[PDB]
């Protein structure tokens, strides 16, 4: 899950 | 998930070293990550962030570096205020981890704890429960590794210890831990044996009583 | 100047709901990309990750604990809820929450994502103790024995923190060393308080002992035993 910027 | 781990856990120093503590990650996580700073009863404090970015107000003696999954934060002269617990967070997956944290201290002379064990009083037995107390006094480094031990079998899950923070005129620090019974199973033994482990000590310790002995 | 700060109930019981409160005052939960994180930290424990908000309303919650919590927004009020179910004593900690930038904009366009990797702003934090303990006075024992002599007192089963402890009315205070309490798996705290002295001095030795919570003072001389 990749944070919301990357 | 991602494991982010700090070394070292804990590290010594004294005003105006230069220390490194570091970060490595178990996957890359890019830049996107962050060190505080925290010291005892505060929030952490942003030092640095998007791994090397120095954030506004914070003192230029900090720094830091890397990429991928290694990171490391460098205090150029360590000053009073910087003795405290670091950690470092990682961004870019979630959840937003953070490291296990390395606390820095004071250093000082080895010091080996002096070791004492409390039988419990005859006030607590009649209540019926049996309390037993070990207490490791001034001692440094922070680590220390207690034992307890009954007619010789080794215990697990019955004990409780708590540290002092490090004392600010002795750099050392003091362990307390206690052993609990009901008072029945205390009284089908004999010998309590609270058994410690330092890096002050050649081998073991090991202080003990026998139960009901006068 | 953003601040934020924390509030809730200091106490609460297991399998109870916790809500908890971030009010903050510096900038809108409407900002471009902004987020408001919780993190918490059990006593002696590291930091721990719990959810995060962010302005547009995407939410996200740690793995681990997603089925306790929700966390929700209230813009208009400059105020972010997380509500975590059940609680149980593991869940003792002080809880943080925190600010998250969004990324740098130049005329409304985003051109730097590089500041949105950290927590920037932190409340103070609030202590949350979940135990199903009532109100209650310690018991106090002694604890009775380089070449140093040790004493105490154990200051056992009571509830809520804190207690204060003083040797000999407050005149006995080098080689004091009073420990931080524990969190007993009855849900009641208990420390000990010891002193070191020259073999010699062995002067009497009395530790005052005061709960103020349940309005129990207590005064308990110690001595080398054997009558």
Redesign the interface.
Known sequence: ???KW? | ?LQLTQSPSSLSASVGDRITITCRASQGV?????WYR?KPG?????L????S?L?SGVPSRFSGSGSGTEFTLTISTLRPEDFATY?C?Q???????????TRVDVRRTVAAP?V?I?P??D??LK?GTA?V?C?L??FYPREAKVQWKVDNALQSGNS?????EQDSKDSTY???S?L?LSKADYEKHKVYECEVTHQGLSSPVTKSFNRGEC | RITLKESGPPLVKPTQTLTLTCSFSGFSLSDFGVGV?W?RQPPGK????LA?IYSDDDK????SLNTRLTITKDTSKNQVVLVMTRVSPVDTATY?CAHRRGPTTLFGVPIAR????????????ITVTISSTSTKGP?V??????G?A?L?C?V?DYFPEPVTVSWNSGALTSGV??????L?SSGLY???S?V?VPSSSLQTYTCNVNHKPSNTKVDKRVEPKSC
């Open positions: 899950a990749l944070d990357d | 998930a890019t830049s996107a990550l962050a925290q505060s929030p952490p404090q942003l640095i962030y998007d791994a970015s954030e950690y967070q961004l870019h997956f979630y959840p937003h981890t953070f490291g296990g944290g002096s004492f409390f419990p009083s006030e607590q209540s309390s107390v207490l006094n001034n409780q210890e708590s540290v002092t003091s362990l307390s206690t609990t | 994180g993190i590291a930091l721990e990750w995060i996200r919650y740690s793995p943080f590089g500041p949105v990797n950290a927590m920037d702003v932190w409340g103070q934090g018991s024992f002694p604890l009775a024995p380089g140093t040790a105490g154990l056992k060393h009073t420990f931080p309490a524990v007993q208990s420390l000990s010891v070191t």
